[PDB]
Design a protein around this ligand. Structure first.
Ligand code: CLA
Ligand code: CLA
Ligand code: CLA
Ligand code: CLA
Ligand code: CLA
Ligand code: CLA
Ligand code: CLA
Ligand code: CLA
Ligand SMILES: CC1=C(/C=C/C(C)=C/C=C/C(C)=C/C=C/C=C(C)/C=C/C=C(C)/C=C/C2=C(C)CCCC2(C)C)C(C)(C)CCC1
Ligand SMILES: CC1=C(C/C=C(\C)CCC[C@H](C)CCC[C@H](C)CCCC(C)C)C(=O)c2ccccc2C1=O
Ligand code: SF4
Ligand code: SF4
Ligand code: SF4
Lengths: 51, 79, 125, 184, 86, 670, 119
């Protein structure tokens, strides 16, 4: 848990504005998703994340 | 991100993402070295637990065993 | 209890003439024939109605998936031959299960060949 | 210092007097006849039933039955006025503090039910004692059954007189205790 | 294989023997009851475990007790038909 | 003869079975007494008594059905708004069912007419009455009187036949006589009788109502005396079913009368043909199936199949006047007969098993392994195929890949044979509508229809697998080699051989009831969603159609989430928000009660009787402590009874849940 | 960029959720056919016999399985039991303590742990 918060997460940004922000559990790497468009779990071209 | 749930949309809750990397590849490799150490030690421990204690070691193994001086005291202090 | 579909003349001669049962076939020949059949057939379900069915290639993906299926079933056959060890294909005085292992290895080779041949026919034609 | 905000909405009495031990002194509750939610709820009941009533003919029997229903609703409104309801729901409450002297108290129904339930149990036990046979349980001896049923009225005295005189309970060494848990 | 044990409370009914579907039980002479006979289980290796013997036993608690041993099952105790373990 | 009809056995409960003669020593005796009540085969005395009991009980049940019909008729004559429904059926909901004004139950009666408040009935009896030319209250009075007279007659006949029939009685065994007289005199000579009834009372009446004279000059024209109208007054050429009656939105009753006449003629001619026709092949069936349980199973299967045909033919082959627009009536008429089809099919399987255990089976039981094995394979194949197309669509829609799912706008599985099945109906290229309501439009079958039909096939095949496995493996099995001696219904053979729980044919029915229920719950949902989405609904004057579900089926029913959201959640808003709403309060309450009963069944389904027996003993300790000894010793329910109670509560609760869910929604929408 | 950790994922996720599970399943089905398979729960394995004998070879655990182990001076116990039975022996009873105990120890249960005959 500590690693995934360190690497695949946004603790450095959530700590600044915790009330409206949302933490990240870890990235999503699943080849079954759409290789096109953008999943509802990612900010367009950015990687996929879980709260 | 396409939010779901009433509260996220009606409060504007957002999930910030760092534009940096988080951990560099060197740090991940440093963690993976110790993870591999844990892995090797855990495989060894699994082997030892699977095979269990060998009582017949006193017939073949060298040495003569040892009971630590506190273990003797704990033996004779009671139970 | 004899039925037409298993004990009739046609059924008996069809089962006996299968690659798994045909008389006079070396184990590698049975493996090669079965593998060619499987590899040629297995390409279709992937290159069509697959995840990349509409891509410009749409067939090399199917070729890779069919070869993967052939390899997986060949690995399963190797597990079977190293655990059950059928001895009906071993020649006299050989390591038990050697005939079955040879058949499975040549099934893998034949699956590769049949998959490649189906892909070649699809691309060329 | 405003206990309402200190405790997240709930309010505390803050006074230690015996006069507040009654349910009627609670600040959560309020008499129904002067509660806004009670008025709104029963007005909505009247409005809905009346709106249903207008849908039918004037001289029909359904109109008369709806008039009777409206009278029942208004009687319910005036009858529950002395009953306590919460200052936010308007639904009258049932008092389970043993008050014995409030509208909607649970002491009177408890007493009535306990009497009649003890009556039922005593009649059944008397019949089982006086008919120590399986044949009398499938083919009920109706005269004896109704005799026990009528005799059950004195259960609160007869049952206690049997309890103290050793005629209700039985020592554990006379009934099957249960499965064995040891022997070796 | 299961474990079928016969206890002294047996009264020589022979009902347990008759109810057994694989001839596990038999009647042996004895002197602990008016029937001068008690049950025995010389062939519990054929005991499937149906417990019909326990159903048929009329003593207060069964004079014959079948103890199931699932980590012990053999081909006879499982009633295997399609498959041979020998 | 009748001097032996004595009440001396009324007090002696359990007399009929010699296993209950020992007396009620335990509470299991009560349940056994109730279980063996109608099991005439195992009851005391000779075989002649079995025949007498069976025939007289049939007559008694027939009297019961006649009494039910009489009750419906009296409700229609004296407790209904059938008058205003006759005058204006398109604005008045049928109602022959009131509720007393007690405990506020008055909230259940709702506005059906300006002078009537009551519970909207969905039995379709009003449409039946109108199709039966019943206009005045006197006609319903005399229908009720005739049904009561029939009840008394059948009751008296059941009473008499217990002593008219004797040890020498043999008329029930004369199967040639039964088949011939039944076929000819009933299917032929009574079908033509009903054709006569229609030609002489419906066509004189129903055209008069459709001609706009609901007055019918009172009795001056309605009371027959209309031989100047001609039998085929308004056939309008065409073909029967191609052109519906524009006024009542149904097939013209002249065509129905002609149908009944021709069907009676056909049945009479078949009875004449049976003097010399194809035989000597069903002859082994002829000799080996002369028994009560086999003929009972055959008749149950036949009647259930006829029930499902009725369910599918009562909805979009409209026969009854003003019935196609009455959507709750259509829904009920389909779904009730669907459920009865399922239940009677299950009963047919059960009695097939009973016949196998009592009588001697036939040749097909000897290759039972190939049969019940290819059935297993086909069940697995169509389960791993039909359902998973739903799982595939669901997963790929969740992944955001709608172009990879099985839909019409995607990889599409065309219903080839159904799309080429324009043979049925073969109507003209448009729709029919009566009054803001769609009468029938052809169901355009696409991918979702294909998948749901395959789901139906899979569920049917699994239920059939359970039934045929119970039937074929009744006498013996590779697992237990003496199942015949164990009887028809038994909990198990013991924990041996790994475990032998639920090998009896009774337990096979126990599982088959669950699987039939699951089979036609999907049928009910498919019908309920498809009709709303694609057939029923309002209209627009510009020929545009606004259905009730707004075409949700073709876009949502391709995924399980679509069924959960657009059917069990969005269409459950009517039932869930039904408190204090006059008509639909009982439906919301019954929805809640059905959930409670269904969950309550699980206590019996999941638990064994030994735990309950030990708990009962613990309680009996406290009872014995206070000198309260029940000499009918309390015993927990037997294993078979526990399973039966669990199954009954499960099916009842689930059926009630669906019942409320569909009926409340259709009553609100209409 | 916020990515660039997916370079690790594209190797690890396929590896540990496909290659490792498949290798583990194949190794497990291979292990299932060893004579040592599940030797701690499956009766009649060779290693179980060797472990039991190894325990019995230890000087402390020689007489560990005997339910009667513990009697420091069994001769004294037997003599006292015989003396106590002599004073209570019924009339001219011919049963001694020694043969009574000998026949009370010898029961007839041939089908007990008969699985100690294959491995
Ligand atoms: C065909 C179906 C399918 C399959 C095979 C997978 C496979 C996978 N998904 Mg996945 N997913 C699917 C459908 C599927 N998904 C759908 C429909 C959704 C909803 C849109 C998701 C949403 C989803 C999320 C949100 C995540 C995954 C993740 C994963 C990976 C985790 C593997 C793992 O750690 O195993 C471990 C397995 C177990 C512990 C189960 C033991 C039993 C794996 C590659 C995770 C990932 O990317 O991991 C890196 C992740 O975070 N999936
Ligand atoms: C995860 C999928 C998978 C698996 C388990 C296998 C398994 C195997 N492959 Mg293989 N293979 C695969 C995908 C896979 N293959 C793909 C996608 C390709 C295309 C590049 C190949 C091309 C390939 C070749 C060319 C050969 C194998 C061979 C083998 C066998 C060694 C073994 C049975 C070898 C074989 O069959 O020798 C007996 C061999 O020569 N494979
Ligand atoms: C009869 C033998 C044969 C022939 C004529 C071809 C012919 C061709 N192959 Mg091919 N191939 C074969 C066997 C064959 N292959 C086998 C046995 C394999 C398995 C290793 C492959 C794997 C293979 C790949 C992976 C690819 C080809 C490609 C090609 C095309 C260049 C050409 C049409 C290439 C191509 O054009 O793909 C679209 C390509 O990418 N082949
Ligand atoms: C067998 C079918 C059947 C069924 C299900 C019902 C059901 C019902 N009838 Mg009914 N009825 C029937 C046959 C049936 N009847 C027959 C054959 C007749 C003619 C003799 C009647 C004559 C009749 C009248 C005259 C009335 C009912 C009423 C009722 C309702 C309340 C009954 C009541 O108060 O309990 C009575 C319970 C007992 C007497 C216990 C025994 C109830 C829905 C009443 C109703 O709907 O009120 C608005 C009512 O007034 N029924
Ligand atoms: C499905 C209905 C049914 C059937 C098949 C029969 C069949 C029979 N009845 Mg029967 N009966 C019925 C209903 C039925 N009944 C009812 C409802 C009543 C009450 C009115 C009677 C009252 C009745 C009497 C009083 C007698 C028969 C008799 C008979 C037998 C000869 C009658 C005949 O020719 O026909 C025959 C076995 C006669 C008989 O047993 O002949 C010896 C006879 O005496 N029945
Ligand atoms: C089987 C049931 C049945 C019954 C009970 C009736 C009853 C009746 N029909 Mg009728 N009808 C029926 C079926 C039935 N119908 C069917 C299926 C059709 C076909 C559409 C008709 C068509 C029909 C017409 C067209 C007429 C009737 C009429 C009548 C009435 C007087 C005629 C009569 O009784 O015939 C008496 C018996 C005969 C006429 C048959 C005699 C034939 C002889 C014996 C044979 C020798 C002929 C010779 C060799 C040449 C009477 C109420 C008439 C009416 O309106 O009266 C009120 C009338 O005009 N019916
Ligand atoms: C020749 C006269 C005649 C007439 C006018 C009808 C008329 C009718 N029949 Mg019919 N029928 C007839 C003879 C006739 N039948 C015969 C001789 C048989 C025996 C094979 C049948 C067997 C039969 C069945 C089994 C069914 C009908 C049905 C129907 C109805 C649907 C019509 C339709 O959609 O057809 C389209 C062309 C209609 C009222 C159906 C029905 O009742 O719908 C509810 C139905 O299921 N009929
Ligand atoms: C024409 C139809 C018909 C007939 C004549 C019979 C006749 C018979 N069946 Mg049978 N059966 C039928 C349909 C029929 N069944 C159907 C459709 C099914 C499938 C569910 C079954 C399933 C079945 C089984 C599993 C068994 C029988 C048995 C029997 C025999 C004894 C029945 C008995 O004593 O029960 C006495 C009657 C009862 C116990 C009725 C109790 C009420 C039921 C169980 C609950 C109904 C709940 C109700 C609908 C909802 C309540 C309303 C709620 C709001 C409160 C008898 C030969 C038994 C036997 O041994 O056969 C030889 C047996 O084991 N049948
Ligand atoms: C539908 C149908 C059917 C079936 C059919 C089938 C079953 C088919 C199959 C088919 C198939 C299944 C085919 C296949 C073929 C194959 C092939 C033809 C192959 C070939 C191959 C090759 C030629 C290869 C070669 C090689 C090798 C060997 C290795 C190396 C490389 C190479 C490439 C050189 C039936 C009769 C039932 C009925 C109806 C119709
Ligand atoms: C609860 C339970 C019992 C105990 C339940 C019993 C003994 C039911 C009998 C209790 C009484 C006699 C039922 C009478 C009806 C109820 C008292 C009231 C029902 C109607 C109310 C709504 C008024 C079993 O015996 C049993 C056996 C096998 C499998 C599962 C179970 C099981 O789940
Ligand atoms: S049934 Fe029981 S009591 Fe009777 S002989 Fe067998 S073991 Fe003995
Ligand atoms: S359990 Fe069954 S097989 Fe075993 S001894 Fe008892 S009756 Fe015989
Ligand atoms: S659990 Fe119940 S059904 Fe199963 S074997 Fe035991 S007693 Fe029979």
């Amino acid at each position: 848990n500590l690693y995934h918060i360190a690497s695949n997460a946004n603790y450095s940004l959530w700590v600044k504005n915790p009330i409206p922000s949302m933490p990240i559990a870890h990235n999503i790497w699943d080849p079954h998703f759409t290789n096109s468009t953008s999943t509802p779990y990612s900010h367009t071209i950015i990687t996929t994340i879980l709260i | 991100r396409v939010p779901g749930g009433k509260r996220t949309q009606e409060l504007g809750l957002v999930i910030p993402m760092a534009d940096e990397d988080g951990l560099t590849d060197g740090q991940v490799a440093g963690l993976f070295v110790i993870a591999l150490v844990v892995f090797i030690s855990a495989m060894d421990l699994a082997k030892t637990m699977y095979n269990g204690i060998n009582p017949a070691k006193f017939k073949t193994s060298k040495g003569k065993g040892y009971i630590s001086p506190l273990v003797k005291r704990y033996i004779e202090n009671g139970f | 209890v004899i039925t037409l579909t298993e004990n009739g003349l046609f059924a008996k001669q069809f089962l006996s003439a299968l690659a798994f049962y045909r008389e006079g076939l070396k184990p590698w020949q049975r493996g090669l024939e079965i593998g060619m059949a499987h590899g040629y057939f297995l390409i279709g379900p992937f290159t069509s109605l697959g995840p990349l069915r509409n891509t410009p290639e749409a067939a090399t993906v199917g070729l890779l998936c069919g070869c993967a299926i052939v390899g997986i079933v060949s690995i399963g056959g190797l597990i079977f031959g190293s655990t059950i060890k059928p001895t009906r294909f071993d020649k006299d005085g050989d390591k038990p299960g050697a005939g079955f292992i040879e058949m499975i290895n040549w099934h893998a080779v034949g699956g590769l060949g049949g998959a490649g041949f189906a892909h070649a026919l699809i691309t060329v034609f | 210092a405003k206990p309402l905000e200190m405790f997240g909405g709930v309010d505390i009495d803050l006074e230690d007097t015996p006069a507040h031990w009654t349910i009627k002194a609670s600040p959560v509750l309020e008499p129904c006849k002067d509660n806004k939610k009670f008025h709104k709820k029963l007005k909505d009941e009247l409005y809905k039933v009346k709106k249903n009533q207008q849908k039918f003919a004037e001289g029909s029997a359904a109109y008369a039955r709806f008039n009777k229903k409206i009278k029942m609703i208004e009687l319910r409104e005036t009858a529950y006025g002395d009953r306590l309801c919460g200052k936010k729901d308007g639904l009258p409450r049932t008092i389970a503090t043993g008050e014995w002297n409030v509208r909607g108290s649970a002491m009177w129904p408890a007493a009535i039910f306990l009497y009649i339930a003890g009556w039922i149990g005593w009649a059944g036990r008397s019949y089982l004692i006086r008919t120590n046979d399986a044949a009398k349980e499938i083919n009920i001896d109706v005269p004896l059954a109704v005799t026990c049923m009528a005799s059950g009225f004195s259960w609160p005295v007869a049952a206690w007189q049997e309890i103290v005189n050793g005629e209700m309970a039985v020592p554990n060494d006379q009934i099957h205790n249960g499965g064995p848990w040891n022997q070796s | 294989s299961h474990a079928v044990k016969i206890y002294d409370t047996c009264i020589g009914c022979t009902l347990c023997v008759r109810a057994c579907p694989t001839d596990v039980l038999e009647m042996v002479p004895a002197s602990i009851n008016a029937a001068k006979q008690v049950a025995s289980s010389p062939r519990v290796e054929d005991c499937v475990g149906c417990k019909r013997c326990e159903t048929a036993c009329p003593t207060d608690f069964l004079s014959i007790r079948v103890y199931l041993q699932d980590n012990e099952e053999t081909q006879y105790s499982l009633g295997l038909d399609l498959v041979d373990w020998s | 003869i009748f001097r032996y009809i004595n009440t001396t056995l009324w007090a002696k409960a359990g007399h009929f079975n010699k296993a209950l003669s020992k007396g009620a020593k335990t509470t299991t005796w009560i349940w056994n007494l109730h279980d063996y009540a109608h099991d005439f085969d195992i009851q005391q005395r000779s075989t002649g008594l079995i025949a007498r009991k069976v025939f007289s009980s049939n007559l008694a049940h027939l009297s019961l059905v006649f009494f039910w019909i009489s009750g419906m008729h009296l409700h229609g004559a004296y407790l209904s708004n059938y008058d205003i429904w006759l005058k204006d059926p398109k604005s008045i909901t049928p109602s022959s069912h009131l509720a007393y004004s007690l405990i506020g139950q008055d909230i259940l009666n709702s506005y059906t007419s300006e002078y009537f408040s009551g519970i909207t009935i969905t039995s379709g009896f009003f449409q039946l009455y109108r199709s039966e030319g019943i206009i005045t209250q006197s006609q319903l009075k005399y229908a009720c009187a005739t049904s009561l007279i029939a009840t008394l007659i059948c009751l008296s006949g059941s009473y008499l036949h217990m002593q008219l029939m004797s040890k020498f009685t043999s008329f029930y065994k004369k199967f040639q006589s039964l088949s011939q007289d039944h076929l000819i005199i009933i299917f032929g000579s009574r079908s033509t009788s009903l054709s006569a009834h229609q030609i002489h009372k419906m066509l004189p009446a129903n055209p008069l109502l459709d001609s706009g004279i609901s007055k019918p000059s009172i009795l001056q024209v309605i009371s027959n005396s209309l031989s100047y109208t001609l039998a085929l007054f308004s056939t309008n050429l065409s073909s029967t079913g191609k052109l519906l009656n524009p006024s009542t939105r149904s097939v013209f009753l002249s065509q129905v009368a002609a149908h009944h006449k021709t069907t009676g003629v056909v049945f009479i001619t078949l009875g004449l043909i049976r003097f010399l026709t194809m035989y000597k092949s069903q002859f082994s069936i002829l000799t080996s199936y002369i028994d009560y349980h086999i003929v009972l199973s055959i008749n149950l299967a036949l009647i259930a199949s006829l029930s499902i045909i009725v369910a599918d033919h009562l909805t979009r082959t409209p026969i009854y006047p003003h019935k196609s627009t009455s959507y709750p009536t259509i829904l009920c008429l389909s779904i009730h007969h669907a459920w009865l089809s399922g239940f009677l099919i299950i009963g047919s399987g059960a009695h097939a098993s009973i016949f196998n255990l009592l009588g001697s089976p036939t040749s097909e039981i000897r290759h039972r392994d190939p049969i019940y094995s290819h059935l297993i394979w086909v069940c697995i194949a169509i389960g791993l195929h039909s359902f998973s197309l739903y799982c595939h669509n669901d997963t790929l829609e969740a992944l955001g890949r709608p172009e990879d799912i099985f839909h019409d706008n995607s990889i599409q599985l065309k219903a080839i044979f159904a799309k080429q099945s324009f043979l049925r109906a073969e109507l003209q290229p448009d729709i029919e509508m009566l009054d803001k309501k769609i009468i029938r439009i052809t169901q355009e079958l696409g991918t979702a229809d294909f998948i749901v039909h395959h789901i139906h096939a899979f569920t049917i095949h699994v239920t059939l697998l359970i039934l045929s496995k119970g039937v074929l493996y009744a006498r013996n099995s590779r697992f237990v080699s003496d199942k015949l001696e164990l009887g028809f219904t038994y909990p198990c053979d013991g924990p041996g051989r790994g475990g032998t729980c639920q090998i009896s044919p009774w337990d096979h029915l126990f599982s088959a009831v669950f699987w039939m229920y699951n089979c036609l719950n999907v049928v009910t949902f498919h019908y309920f969603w498809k009709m709303q989405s694609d057939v029923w609904g309002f209209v627009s004057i510009q020929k545009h159609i606004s259905h009730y579900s707004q075409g949700d089926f073709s876009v949502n029913s391709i995924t399980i989430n679509g069924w959960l959201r657009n059917l069990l959640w969005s269409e459950a808003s009517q039932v869930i928000q039904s408190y204090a709403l006059s008509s639909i309060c009982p439906y919301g309450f019954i929805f809640l009660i059905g959930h409670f009963i269904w969950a309550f069944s699980l206590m019996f389904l999941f638990s064994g009787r030994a735990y309950w027996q030990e708990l009962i003993e613990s309680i009996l300790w406290s009872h014995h402590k206070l000198k309260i000894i029940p000499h009918i010793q309390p015993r927990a329910l037997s294993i078979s009874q526990g399973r039966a109670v669990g199954f009954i509560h499960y099916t009842l609760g689930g059926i009630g849940s669906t019942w409320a869910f569909i009926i409340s929604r259709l009553l609100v929408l209409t | 960029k916020y990515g660039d950790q997916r370079k690790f994922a594209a190797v690890l996720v396929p590896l540990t959720t496909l290659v490792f599970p498949a290798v583990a399943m194949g190794m497990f089905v291979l292990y299932s056919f060893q004579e040592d398979a599940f030797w701690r729960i499956v009766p009649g394995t060779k290693r179980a016999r060797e472990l039991d004998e190894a325990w019995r070879e230890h000087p402390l655990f020689a007489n560990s399985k005997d339910p009667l182990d513990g009697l420091i001076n069994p001769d004294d116990y037997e003599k006292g039991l015989e003396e106590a039975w002599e004073r209570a022996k019924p009339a001219g009873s011919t049963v001694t303590v020694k043969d009574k105990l000998k026949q009370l120890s010898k029961q007839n249960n041939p089908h007990w742990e008969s699985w100690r005959a294959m491995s």
